[PDB]
Design an enzyme around this catalytic site. Structure first.
Site, PDB file in Angstrom:
ATOM      1  N   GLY A  47       0.838  -1.217   0.000  1.00 22.85           N
ATOM      2  CA  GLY A  47       0.000   0.000   0.000  1.00 22.85           C
ATOM      3  C   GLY A  47       0.857   1.244   0.000  1.00 22.85           C
ATOM      4  O   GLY A  47       2.073   1.120   0.286  1.00 22.85           O
ATOM      5  N   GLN A  52       3.117  10.120   1.370  1.00 22.97           N
ATOM      6  CA  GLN A  52       4.405   9.397   1.521  1.00 22.97           C
ATOM      7  C   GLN A  52       5.327   9.767   0.366  1.00 22.97           C
ATOM      8  O   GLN A  52       6.533   9.616   0.522  1.00 22.97           O
ATOM      9  CB  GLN A  52       4.234   7.878   1.570  1.00 22.97           C
ATOM     10  CG  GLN A  52       3.610   7.359   2.860  1.00 22.97           C
ATOM     11  CD  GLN A  52       3.431   5.861   2.781  1.00 22.97           C
ATOM     12  OE1 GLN A  52       2.431   5.389   2.255  1.00 22.97           O
ATOM     13  NE2 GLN A  52       4.415   5.099   3.235  1.00 22.97           N
ATOM     14  N   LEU A  96       7.038   1.659   4.095  1.00 23.47           N
ATOM     15  CA  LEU A  96       8.217   2.068   3.291  1.00 23.47           C
ATOM     16  C   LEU A  96       8.783   3.382   3.830  1.00 23.47           C
ATOM     17  O   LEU A  96       9.956   3.639   3.605  1.00 23.47           O
ATOM     18  CB  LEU A  96       7.796   2.149   1.827  1.00 23.47           C
ATOM     19  CG  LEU A  96       7.240   0.812   1.333  1.00 23.47           C
ATOM     20  CD1 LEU A  96       6.092   0.998   0.356  1.00 23.47           C
ATOM     21  CD2 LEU A  96       8.354  -0.075   0.776  1.00 23.47           C
ATOM     22  N   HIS A 137      -4.289   1.248   8.125  1.00 17.30           N
ATOM     23  CA  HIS A 137      -2.868   1.654   8.021  1.00 17.30           C
ATOM     24  C   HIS A 137      -2.723   2.846   7.056  1.00 17.30           C
ATOM     25  O   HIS A 137      -2.037   3.810   7.413  1.00 17.30           O
ATOM     26  CB  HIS A 137      -2.015   0.451   7.618  1.00 17.30           C
ATOM     27  CG  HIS A 137      -0.567   0.748   7.426  1.00 17.30           C
ATOM     28  ND1 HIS A 137       0.406   0.315   8.314  1.00 17.30           N
ATOM     29  CD2 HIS A 137       0.081   1.406   6.438  1.00 17.30           C
ATOM     30  CE1 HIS A 137       1.591   0.695   7.870  1.00 17.30           C
ATOM     31  NE2 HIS A 137       1.413   1.355   6.718  1.00 17.30           N
ATOM     32  N   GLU A 138      -3.334   2.783   5.881  1.00 21.29           N
ATOM     33  CA  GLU A 138      -3.098   3.790   4.807  1.00 21.29           C
ATOM     34  C   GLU A 138      -3.842   5.076   5.130  1.00 21.29           C
ATOM     35  O   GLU A 138      -3.332   6.153   4.875  1.00 21.29           O
ATOM     36  CB  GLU A 138      -3.602   3.291   3.462  1.00 21.29           C
ATOM     37  CG  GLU A 138      -2.763   2.181   2.898  1.00 21.29           C
ATOM     38  CD  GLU A 138      -1.327   2.597   2.663  1.00 21.29           C
ATOM     39  OE1 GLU A 138      -1.079   3.775   2.248  1.00 21.29           O
ATOM     40  OE2 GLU A 138      -0.465   1.753   2.912  1.00 21.29           O
ATOM     41  N   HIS A 141      -1.951   7.487   7.400  1.00 26.23           N
ATOM     42  CA  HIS A 141      -1.046   8.456   6.705  1.00 26.23           C
ATOM     43  C   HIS A 141      -1.723   9.783   6.388  1.00 26.23           C
ATOM     44  O   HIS A 141      -1.004  10.807   6.343  1.00 26.23           O
ATOM     45  CB  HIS A 141      -0.576   7.901   5.377  1.00 26.23           C
ATOM     46  CG  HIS A 141       0.408   6.812   5.556  1.00 26.23           C
ATOM     47  ND1 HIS A 141       1.615   7.028   6.157  1.00 26.23           N
ATOM     48  CD2 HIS A 141       0.363   5.504   5.227  1.00 26.23           C
ATOM     49  CE1 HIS A 141       2.298   5.902   6.177  1.00 26.23           C
ATOM     50  NE2 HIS A 141       1.549   4.949   5.623  1.00 26.23           N
TER      51      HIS A 141
HETATM   52 NI    NI Z   1       2.442   3.154   5.521  1.00 23.88          NI
END
Ligand code: NI
Ligand code: NI
Length: 166
Positions: A47, A52, A96, A137-138, A141
Site C-alpha cells: 500500500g 508518503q 516504506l 494503516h493507509e 497516513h
Molecule cells: Ni504506511
C-alpha cells in the site's frame, strides 16, 4: 517511480487535503496514480499514501494477491472509516516510510470504508482481518499517523532481520 519520504519528514505529519471534485477523472490525477502504482510495485509494498511521496492529497492505493490472504487492487480517494464493532486484532506491520523495521499493532478487526474512486464513483465496502488492517494503516497516513504512534506493546517493535531471521 518517486521518492518515499522517511519518518521524521514533517510532510508525513500533515492532515492531508481532500482531492478536489474538479480533478476527478483528470489526466493529472491519472499520472499521480500511475507513479504511485509504479513506485509501490518497485519497492514491493502492499500500500501507499500520496503524502508518503510528499503529495498533500487524501489518496491511497493498496492491493495484495500472489501464490499462497488477497486484497483487491483499489484506489481510494477522500476515505472515511467506520469500525463495525469493538473487536481488535494485533498483527505485524511495516511501511516504506519506516524502512528496516516491523511492529505489532492492534487494529479494528471489522470496518466499513467509504470514499471515491478516481472517476468520482462512490466506494462503500465492509471488510475484516488483513483487508481491514491495510485500509486503517493507509488512512492513518492521511491524518499524519505512522504505525509506531499506534504500537501498544513495544516488546514487538524491532528491526526486521532481528525479529525475522528469514
Ligand atoms: Ni504506511
Ligand atoms: Ni471545489
Amino acid at each position: 517511480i518517486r521518492e518515499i519520504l522517511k519518518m521524521g519528514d514533517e510532510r508525513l505529519l500533515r492532515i492531508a487535503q481532500p482531492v478536489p471534485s474538479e480533478l476527478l477523472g483528470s489526466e493529472e490525477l491519472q499520472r499521480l496514480i500511475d507513479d504511485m502504482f509504479e513506485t509501490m510495485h518497485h519497492v514491493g509494498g502492499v500500500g501507499l499514501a500520496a503524502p508518503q511521496i510528499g503529495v498533500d492529497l487524501q489518496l491511497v492505493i493498496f492491493g495484495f494477491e500472489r501464490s499462497e490472504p488477497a486484497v483487491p487492487p483499489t484506489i481510494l480517494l477522500n476515505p472515511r472509516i467506520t469500525p463495525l464493532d469493538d473487536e481488535m486484532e494485533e498483527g505485524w506491520e511495516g511501511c516504506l516510510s519506516v524502512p528496516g523495521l516491523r511492529g505489532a499493532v492492534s487494529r479494528h478487526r471489522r470496518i466499513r470504508y467509504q470514499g471515491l474512486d478516481p472517476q468520482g464513483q462512490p466506494i462503500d465496502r465492509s471488510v475484516e482481518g488483513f483487508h481491514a488492517r491495510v485500509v486503517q494503516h493507509e488512512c492513518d497516513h492521511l491524518i499524519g499517523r505512522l504505525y509506531p504512534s499506534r504500537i501498544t506493546d513495544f516488546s514487538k517493535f524491532g528491526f526486521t532481520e532481528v525479529l525475522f531471521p528469514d
